[PDB]
Amino acid sequence: VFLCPGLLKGVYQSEHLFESDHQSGAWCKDPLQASDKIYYMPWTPYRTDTLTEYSSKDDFIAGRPTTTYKLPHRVDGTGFVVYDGALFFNKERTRNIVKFDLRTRIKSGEAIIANANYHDTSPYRWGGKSDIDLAVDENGLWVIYATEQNNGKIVISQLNPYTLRIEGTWDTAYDKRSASNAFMICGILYVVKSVGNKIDYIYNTDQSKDSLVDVPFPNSYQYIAAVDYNPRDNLLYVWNNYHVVKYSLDFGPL
Ligand SMILES: [Mg+2]
């Protein structure tokens, strides 16, 4: 139902919402619902198992939550998405995605992402990245991971949010270790790298074709940031070194 905005060509911060008391975390809306609801999950290393819900941006900024959800498992890293009333997250130190129904507060499904690497981060690196990242876009729900079969390079799969069937899988050429964030727009994978920071690689799943690109991120962006795209409003939902902000996006023709 969402029309593709085009090929991403620019990124800039467009709203500062508040400074959180947690350095890292993730936040997002449910793009499949016409709703002001906001979902918020601060990252506490190896202890993350609650989701907070706010009814509006005003309530969010003011710190007036509606409710909290106690998740049935702990979450790996910062990642989660909400898609048509269901929460999806990577179960801590597994290659599993959990589906949790928010309305009834119970787990409705799990899917093992075949061959996905997990619990394999070098001792030295910041542990806030999820082994399997989730992303929502115009085309549906996505998992972004790596496999040994693809030499630690990023693999993309489309996941049906209702049946949990894998609908397609693509091997990219990009080493997952080199990425700070990855997100989908119109079925195209954008990968953010350190240089400053920029998108330097895209993978178009419709075409099964990748390219090198150069889209600078703001200087204030850090590696430890969490970034999620929203296809309903075409914004990036960002959590960056305590700061809860949105980025706006400029597009050119596909
Ligand atoms: Mg994300």
Instruction: Tell me the binding residues for Ca(2+).
Output: 133, 181-182, 227
- The position carrying tokens 């130190």 is 93
Ligand 1 mean position, distance from CA 33 (Å) = 19
- Strand, coil or helix: what is 20? coil
Ligand 1 mean position, distance from CA 58 (Å) = 23
Q: What residues have CB less than 8 Å from 156, skipping those under 6 apart?
A: 142, 143, 144, 169, 170, 172, 184, 189, 203, 205
**Alpha helical stretches, state H, 71-134:** none
Experimental determination approach used: X-ray
Residue type, 4: C
Please give the Cα distance from 242 to 23 (Å, whole number): 4
Residue type, 74: R
Ligand 1 mean position, distance from CA 240 (Å) = 12
**Alpha helical stretches, state H, the chain:** 57-62
- The position carrying tokens 């998740």 is 71
DSSP conformation class of 74: P
Residues with CB under 5 A from ligand 1 (ion): 228
Ligand 1 mean position, distance from CA 130 (Å) = 9
Resolution (Å) of this entry: 1.6
With beta carbons less than 8 A apart as the criterion, state whether 215 and 198 touch: yes
Strands 209-216 and 226-230 come out as unpaired
Ligand 1 mean position, distance from CA 112 (Å) = 19
Tokens standing for residue 52: 């907070």
Ligand 1 mean position, distance from CA 133 (Å) = 7
Nearest CA to 185 among 140, 143, 122, 121?
A: 140
With beta carbons less than 8 A apart as the criterion, state whether 169 and 120 touch: no
Nearest CA to 247 among 183, 203, 188?
A: 183
Tokens standing for residue 136: 């929502």
With beta carbons less than 8 A apart as the criterion, state whether 139 and 128 touch: no
With beta carbons less than 8 A apart as the criterion, state whether 65 and 52 touch: yes
Ligand 1 mean position, distance from CA 158 (Å) = 15
Ligand 1 mean position, distance from CA 28 (Å) = 9
With beta carbons less than 8 A apart as the criterion, state whether 60 and 39 touch: no
